[PDB]
Amino acid sequence: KMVVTLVVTTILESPYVMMKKNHEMLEGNERY
C-alpha cells in the first residue's frame, strides 16, 4: 500500500471522597 516515508489525588475518608455504588463495575474518574 502507500508506504509513507517521513493529576488529582484524594483520600479514602467517608464524607470527603467516598466510593459510590457499583465501584467495582464502574471504576475510574467517574467512580468517586
* HEC-encoded secondary structure of the chain: CCCCCCCCCCCCCCCCCCCCCCCCCCCCCCCC
The number of CA neighbours under 13 Å toward the Cβ of 15 is 0
Residue with cell string 475518608: 13
Find the discontinuities in the chain where C to next N exceeds 2.5 angstroms and give the residue preceding each.
Answer: 6
31 touches 25 (CB < 8 A) = no
Residue with cell string 475510574: 28
Cα angle 22, 26, 32 (rounded to 5 degrees) comes to: 80
Q: Which of left, alpha, beta for 12 (phi over 0: left; psi -120 to 50: alpha)? A: alpha
31 touches 19 (CB < 8 A) = yes
Q: Is the dihedral of CA 14, 18, 21, 23 positive or negative?
A: negative
What was the elucidation method?
Answer: cryo-EM
Stated resolution in angstroms: 3.4
